[PDB]
Amino acid sequence: SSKFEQKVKEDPDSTESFFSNITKYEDINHTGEVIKTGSLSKYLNSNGGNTNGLEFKPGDFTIVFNNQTYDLSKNSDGTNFKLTGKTEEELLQNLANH
Amino acid sequence: SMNINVTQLAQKDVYQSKGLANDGGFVNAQLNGTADLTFFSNGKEYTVTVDKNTTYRDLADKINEASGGEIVAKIVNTGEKGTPYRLTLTSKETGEDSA
Amino acid sequence: DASLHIQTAQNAEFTLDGIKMFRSSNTVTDLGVGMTLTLNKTGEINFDVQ
Amino acid sequence: DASLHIQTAQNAEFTLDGIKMFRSSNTVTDLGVGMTLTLNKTGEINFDVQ
Amino acid sequence: SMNINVTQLAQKDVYQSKGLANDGGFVNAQLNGTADLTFFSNGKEYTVTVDKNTTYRDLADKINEASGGEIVAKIVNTGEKGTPYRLTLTSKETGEDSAISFYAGKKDSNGKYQKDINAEKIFDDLGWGLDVSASIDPDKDKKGYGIKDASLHIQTAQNAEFTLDGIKMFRSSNTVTDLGVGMTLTLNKTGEINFDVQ
Amino acid sequence: SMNINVTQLAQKDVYQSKGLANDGGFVNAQLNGTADLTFFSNGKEYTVTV
Amino acid sequence: TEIKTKLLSFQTAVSSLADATVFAKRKVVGSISDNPPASLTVNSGVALQ
């Protein structure tokens, strides 16, 4: 048993790995179904900067990861960003980049 | 042969938080010497470095990183100038060191 | 703002012959070379090992 | 006078090493929830953690 | 049959050092040919030689060797934040005979001491800070200095004690040896109790 | 049926004396002849010449 | 028949231990959800006492 204690204290994960390995979720597959240029481009910031806005109730658009809320407020390319970003193509390309 | 004694009473937490931010938290910036912020657990660590990555969320997320969420609560999700969440919480674990 | 922290939890440290021990968490494997002790909640104990 | 309410149903109560609180109706749950005590019958007990 | 009480226990003196960085360090960080450390317990003398390979632990081991177990050791890694360590020592002698005492001096051709104050200041380094009440060339004295601190007093020297139905007795040991025709007894608390053989 | 309280220790006449350097110490080695002593205990009388 | 039952029974123990039922939680008794006689409960990250 001292070996049993050793391996767990050494590493529970590998120790569980002998009996089982890990919890499995459903494959994370889902689609942003319909987007095209010119849908919100000027509520979006087609101005290049951050001069434009779009209406929302708080939490209308958000990520949740590890049950923690996650961010939608910066460019993955590093340029000027907002939650209602520059354009439809830019916003959704940045997330995949993110 | 020896004597050991143990007499110390554990206690519990009661809590209501400030809210988690919406998608905007601009606050501050850095200095010449690297400005570093870090969040702890009685010996381990949880970190971010500031060049301009200086939002409330950067901090709050790491606070979540350190706090870990081993807590119980009941939920309110309304908003406060860009802050969709507020909760009343009470402890699920123990410790004074754990403050 | 411990006021958001409406109430606070606490821990238990341990004492010893002559000594009392500061800690970051409950553990007494640090008796010496491997000798491991654990702290229950309230009591004294006198020792013999046999 | 209070005597007309028979023996006056009231709280359910306990004690925890100098800590106490009052709840009876339908439940005894909100005793600082997260780690909580609940009451239905007379009892005495001790525990230890592993 | 009889009534009993107990109101002393013959526990030992045990003393400790201050929080050292570690006992892997040397009796002092560096040394001459030797430094010499002395202990006593119930009138017996115990002397050790330090050398330029002697860690504090080596000192503890030599104390056991020089004492031949007459003074016993138990050492601590306190695990305290930043300074997890102490060093402690124990007596063989117990009861009213239990006490320990502390000194530093080297032996000579007469089998006689010479006072090594250089080794005496090593004791305060080892936290058994000498209780200065000893003007001593120990061969005649045999009481070294005590120590300075009570929290460093791991255990105290004191006698064992009890009554028997009208009578009170003090005893160097917690083991009562010959209560009768093939009897022996232990003391476990300072309290009253009654007994019968039947 | 009966209930009992007990308030008074039945005791003996228990003596213990001066400290002796010697139990073999002489109560008397050259007594000037003999002495004459008398005692009563356990409801009984006693007489001796020493 | 008997031996197959032995393998079936042994097989179950093998099946039981395949599950890492044991979890990284502090350990204490009592977890009922509704109308037990009494229970005080503590959880999986506590400082142990």
In sequence order, the β-bridge partners of residue E195 are E2
- Please give the structure tokens belonging to residue E68: 């031949």
Is residue E10 within 8 A of residue E158, CB to CB? The reply is yes
- Please give the structure tokens belonging to residue F3: 């209930």
Is residue A69 within 8 A of residue A75, CB to CB? The reply is no
Say what the alpha-carbon torsion angle B86, B90, B93, B97 is, to the nearest 10 degrees. 80
Reference C43, options E164, G16, B8, E47; nearest CA is B8
Instruction: Give B69-77 contacts, CB < 8 A, sequence gap 24+.
Output: B69/A67, B69/A68, B70/G43, B70/G44, B70/G45, B71/B13, B71/B15, B71/D34, B72/D33, B72/D34, B77/A59
CA distances from F8 to C27, E46, F11, F41, G20 (A): 51, 54, 9, 21, 66
Q: Resolution in angstroms, to 1 decimal, for this deposition?
A: 6.5
Reference A69, options B23, E181, D47, E170; nearest CA is B23
Containing H/E element for A13? helix A12-19
Q: Given a contact as 3+ CB pairs under 8 Å, which chains touch D? A: B, C, G
Q: How many helices (H) and strands (E) does chain D have?
A: 0, 1
**Phi and psi angles of residue E134, each rounded to the nearest 5 degrees, phi first:** -160, 105
Can you tell me the distance from the alpha carbon of E124 to that of D4, in angstroms, rounded to the nearest whole number?
Answer: 77
Q: Considering all CA atoms of chain F, what is the largest pairwise distance in Å, rounded to the nearest integer? A: 65
Interface A–G counts its CB contacts (< 8 A) at: 9
Reference A11, options C32, A21, B45; nearest CA is A21
- Helix (H, G, I), strand (E, B), or coil: what is residue E66? helix
- Please give the structure tokens belonging to residue E113: 């001491």
- Please give the structure tokens belonging to residue C14: 């341990």
Contacts of D45 (CB under 8 A, 6+ apart): G38, G40
User: Could you say which of C19, C22, C46 has the minimum Cβ distance to residue E86?
Assistant: C19
Is residue B21 within 8 A of residue B56, CB to CB? The reply is yes
Is residue E98 within 8 A of residue E12, CB to CB? The reply is yes
- Please give the structure tokens belonging to residue E111: 């089998």
Can you tell me the distance from the alpha carbon of A86 to that of A80, in angstroms, rounded to the nearest whole number?
Answer: 8
Can you tell me the distance from the alpha carbon of E39 to that of E157, in angstroms, rounded to the nearest whole number?
Answer: 15
- Helix (H, G, I), strand (E, B), or coil: what is residue F9? coil
Can you tell me the distance from the alpha carbon of C18 to that of E106, in angstroms, rounded to the nearest whole number?
Answer: 31
Q: How far is C11 from chain D (nearest CA, A)?
A: 14
**Contact: chain G with chain C (3+ CB pairs below 8 Å):** yes
Reference B19, options B92, B66, B67, B77; nearest CA is B77
Q: How far is G43 from chain D (nearest CA, A)?
A: 7
Obtained via which technique?
cryo-EM
